[PDB]
Symmetry: C3
Subunit: 137 residues, 3 copies
């Protein structure tokens, strides 16, 4: 039963794949907080850029490494690069989907660490604590 404050962060190498253009490398900051136990925040930025932050369900990324899935405008699916296992994340927009491309190992490792803090199915405990703090604040 981890402390109410616990949180983890890492950085992951990514590529922005654009239809009629070459790939653009970029680093994404992933983080997970036990106070928001169903979520993963991801801050993407290109080169010397201030980030834009996406927030989505942790389970969507766990499932998306294994099979094509999605929620609303987010869409995640796996892929191969010969032997190398990849995961693809896309934001849907009428103005054309943009697409991220990353290797599985680092995302998997990060997710494994999040599950060590809060195992799948025990998120409730942390929701209860959040509710309890609010009920005294």
């Amino acid at each position: 039963m981890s402390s109410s404050g616990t949180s983890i962060t890492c950085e992951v190498g990514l590529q922005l794949i654009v239809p009629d253009r070459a790939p653009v490398p970029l680093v994404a900051r992933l983080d997970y907080s036990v106070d928001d136990p169903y979520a993963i925040r991801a801050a993407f930025h290109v080169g010397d850029d201030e980030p834009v932050e996406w927030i989505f369900a942790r389970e969507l990324l766990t499932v998306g490494i294994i099979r094509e899935t999605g929620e609303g405008d987010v869409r995640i699916w796996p892929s191969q690069d010969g032997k190398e296992r990849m995961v693809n994340i896309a934001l849907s927009s009428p103005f054309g989907q943009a697409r991220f491309h990353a290797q599985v190992a680092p995302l998997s490792e990060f997710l494994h660490r999040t599950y060590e803090l809060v195992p799948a199915g025990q998120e409730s405990d942390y929701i209860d604590i959040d509710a309890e703090i609010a009920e005294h604040l």
Copy 2:
């Protein structure tokens, strides 16, 4: 507010960021993950109960909804569908009542009952 054992409803003072307005929140065990809010200037928003519980403590969001806390010296909650401003005390009390009917993590039982009803129509 008022509780029936099956459904709960309350009214909460809000501001559209300022213009004051009253919102009607309600929760029903037959939709155990959801909270419905109804505004006036009527329009109904429906979102995950957990999103509001988490949003009182820290910035979070789902799709177009974004919820985050703030200070007025008084603890506030901000909801912003792609900007509402309200006191935490009333929302917290309402959420506590919903958790008394259906504790976090036991929503499944009520989903099972909804499925059981449907299998016979």
Copy 3:
């Protein structure tokens, strides 16, 4: 405990509610994505796939509910279910209900966690 590959599919008659236009939708559920249901259909316009929470459909057959853009609610005609994404489908409950029952037989409501744990475990060994 069903195996990691288990999946079910069915076809369901639908109407897009102008004049009503009949169309067939392909629903499928996979234990690897235990909270989700996929919906795929076409008119004429190449196919399009929607993905939503299983529980949203189970709840929507009983009462008005929604998540983000999706909105599901029941109605009378024969018992009907109405689904309405934004940027209106009309179907009988019997077939959806039977399909949802089959999905709960594979993965009961509340045991999705086990299948998430397997998905994590596979990734961890890739």
